[PDB]
Amino acid sequence: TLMIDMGLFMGRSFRVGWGPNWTLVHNGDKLSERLNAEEDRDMDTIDYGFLPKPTSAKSLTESPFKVHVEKLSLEQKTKDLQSYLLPLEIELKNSTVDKSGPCPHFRPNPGVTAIHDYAGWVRNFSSEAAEVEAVVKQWGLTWTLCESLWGQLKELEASLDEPNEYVKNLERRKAFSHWLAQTAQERIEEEVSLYGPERHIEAVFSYLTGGRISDACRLAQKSGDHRLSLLLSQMVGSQEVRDLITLQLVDWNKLQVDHYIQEERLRVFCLLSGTPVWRSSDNRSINVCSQLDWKRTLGIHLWYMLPPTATVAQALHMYEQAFQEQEGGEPYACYPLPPYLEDCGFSFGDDPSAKFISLQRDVCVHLLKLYSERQYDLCQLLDPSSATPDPLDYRLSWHMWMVLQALNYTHLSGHRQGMLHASYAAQLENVGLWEWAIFVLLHIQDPHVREAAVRELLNRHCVVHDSPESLAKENFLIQRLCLPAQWIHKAKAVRSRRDGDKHKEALYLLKSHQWNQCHKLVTRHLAADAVINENYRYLRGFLGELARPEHCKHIQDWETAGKVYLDYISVIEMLNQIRQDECSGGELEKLHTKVMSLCKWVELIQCYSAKGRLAQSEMAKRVANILRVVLSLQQPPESMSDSSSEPRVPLRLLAPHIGRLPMPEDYALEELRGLTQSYLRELICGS
């Protein structure tokens, strides 16, 4: 359209908004205009599902107006449930249920099996379903790396472990080797199709990067490669082997033979000799780095740069100095990157400016820094998005820092910790798995911040409905979640106060026992409803439980109305039943005593509504009717009480109170006439 015009005014135009379920409402154009084809207008659900019901529809002559509303979706959806569910199914046992607060609070309960069940199941699923994702593989990677730095494997649980520092270092290194053995399986499977005896030196490089001497030798023999096979054993021989190679290659240098020998076997030779960078007579820098992983780099460093039986930390230290600046000189090793970033290129050293450009840092390398020195800023450990495309599933890493607290490390800023707690529970509320978002939240120590948050979850998630699925939902909420139904009744009660389901508001107000307000609302509505519709059962139970004296203690004016109408209904039912059988005077006398009394308090009935006074009038007419019936029938047709006596009427006490209320001339006529002949005898026999 037009946008050229400028000035001090204008703006005071478009904005945007957010809605629940993580959706966004916007006059702005949707996000699915790059997801599907042949699009529509006023699309207000993700994908498809916006129904053709009234909306913002205008013609095209001056430009019409619309609003799209979208719930952002990410990645692909096939069976994404289990990838989240299983880490949480294990965290179930890894957690605790403290009951402090108006619902239980969850405190951590990790140890050494915390990552033993997580990671093992990661593999278990990764084998049971061949449909896992490369990001799943990334998180298994992180699982294994954390396990190696702290967790305890089974190969040293079936073997006694020994406390000598050297034993610890070598055990940490042999576990690292078994790890690399697990890792490089698919790498070997990929480049094995790639290579052959034509590419046999490239296979040599791969086999050296693996330290996979066994199957390397097996290949060389199935191919009859005797000289190479003999070379293979020498790869990790004695230091004298490397003295041999140093002097031998100094000789070849004096011999210039390299010019006649391919640098291919020469890089094999560098690998054997522990020389990462060669400086020829021409000062030709023959470097060893190719196709590798930084994992493979430090593995080579272990096996070959120093004693292969050495520790973790110093080898890491040399590797880090190697791909960092040494004395202002060029890095010479590989700079760690997250997986989706080495997807976009990788480095082998040199030119620290090209490292300065962006080149984040692998999270695995940061873990070693925290495992090496205890005075590490740990800040390099964060954002699991380093080895994954996006930070969508913090499951592994989260479980990891819980295991770290079990290990007495990660003394990090709790604000960042709880912030990421919120991030992961946010992932949960994104996927819409609520019980899960809850308990994942529940492991944090800011109490009514937690309570407010969980109220947010309750409000978003609990909508009053009747369904067996919902019923199972509270089943879960109670059986191990053990969550006081106080909150659920609160939420479904305000839900009902929104929608207008009388049964449900009444039921859940009783269940949560908001005594005062439930009192006031029932008085406002429910009393008249039940009396006029004659459904005494429900509010009978209602007033019965309300009549308990403690309830009387927490509510003002319970005595004024509630137990009063309870008395009405109780008298009604008992007098009905006493005639449903043959009557006994031992309850008829109680009828007279309580009826003539409550006549005295019918006066104090205060109606602040037209319908309230209308129900009051209906009550008055009905009580007059039943009073006539009972005063007629209290002289039973076969067991008369008095012979013929016309007793003096208690109207001398009734009138000063009954005269305090108005009466509808419809039946006030007959009542007032009976009252006329009453006053006639009363005055002919007056004072």
Binding site: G11, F14, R15, D44, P54, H415, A422, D446, H448
Partner: protein
């Protein structure tokens, strides 16, 4: 539908009714269900062009307020399926521009600023009076944008159990058209000067409180006409630790900032007919994670 393009439109707490306000002189309302929607109403009344409304918290129920050019704020409460005009205020010299509800923890009080240079804050008992808290010379020129105190945010409350209720001091923020931003706390029955901020040498347009759930700190995204977006942050105002950082240098007059209902990310209206979706990345920096072409 609406005769003029929409400034603001807000769904409920429950996702099942939408209010949509334009300067098209009236505001229309749909029920929301199944993906379908029926325009349940179009409320008239506003004798000035309309910009903004204000929903209230669910434990109160269903409450809406609205500003217009006519210096009138109209106040709407829903009954039996019918939203209707319940309280209305005027007395203002310039169009009432900013209205925003306070957290239900503080109650049912709306904040009402206009470019008058001064601002009132109006409480509804919910059945009773509209308590007036009017502050004059709130600006030497006028009020542009205002934000409340969100009621509960980390920083000292870890040791405060969930069973008890803490002291609720009232504070808030805003920025005006005197080239200044300011911060207010409530006491003695009135509001006095937390802070004066003079970094945008030009008028500030919109202000964004980071919903600092998980944050001990105090975080602001301030957007002005001058193209500078300041993240103002203080871990402690008593030690006076507010500092500016750049979020983005947009070359347009920088317009609007609004946090998600999920309280996760920020939407920023730019002079590009676009709304940039920024998220403070997990690490340390503000990354425009997406966009919506308006």
């Amino acid at each position: 539908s609406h005769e003029d393009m929409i400034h603001d439109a807000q769904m409920d707490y429950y996702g099942i009714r939408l209010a949509t306000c334009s300067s098209d002189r009236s505001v229309k309302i749909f029920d929301v269900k199944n993906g379908g929607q029926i325009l349940i109403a179009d409320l008239r009344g506003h004798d000035g062009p309309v910009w903004q409304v204000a929903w209230a918290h669910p434990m109160y129920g269903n409450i809406l307020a609205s500003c217009s050019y006519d210096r009138k704020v109209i106040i709407w409460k829903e009954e039996n399926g019918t939203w209707e005009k319940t309280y209305e205020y005027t007395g203002h010299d310039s169009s009432v521009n900013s209205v925003c509800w306070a957290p239900h923890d503080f109650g049912l009080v709306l904040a009402c600023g206009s470019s008058d240079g001064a601002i009132s804050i109006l409480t509804f008992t919910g059945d009773g009076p509209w308590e007036v808290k009017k502050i004059s010379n709130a600006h030497t020129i006028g009020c542009n944008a205002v934000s409340w105190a969100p009621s509960v945010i980390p920083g000292s409350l870890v040791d405060q159990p969930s069973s008890q209720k803490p002291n609720y001091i009232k504070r808030f923020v805003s920025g005006g058209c005197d080239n200044l931003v300011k911060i207010w706390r409530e006491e003695d029955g009135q509001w006095k000067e937390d802070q004066k901020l003079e970094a945008h040498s030009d008028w500030v347009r919109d202000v964004a409180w980071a919903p600092s759930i998980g944050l001990p700190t105090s975080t602001i995204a301030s957007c002005s006409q001058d193209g500078r977006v300041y993240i103002w942050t203080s871990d402690d105002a008593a030690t006076n630790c507010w500092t500016p950082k750049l979020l983005h240098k947009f070359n347009d007059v920088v317009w609007h900032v609004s946090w998600s209902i999920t309280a996760n990310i920020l939407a920023v209206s730019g002079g590009d007919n676009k709304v940039t979706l920024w998220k403070e990345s997990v690490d340390g920096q503000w990354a425009c994670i997406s966009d919506v072409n308006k």
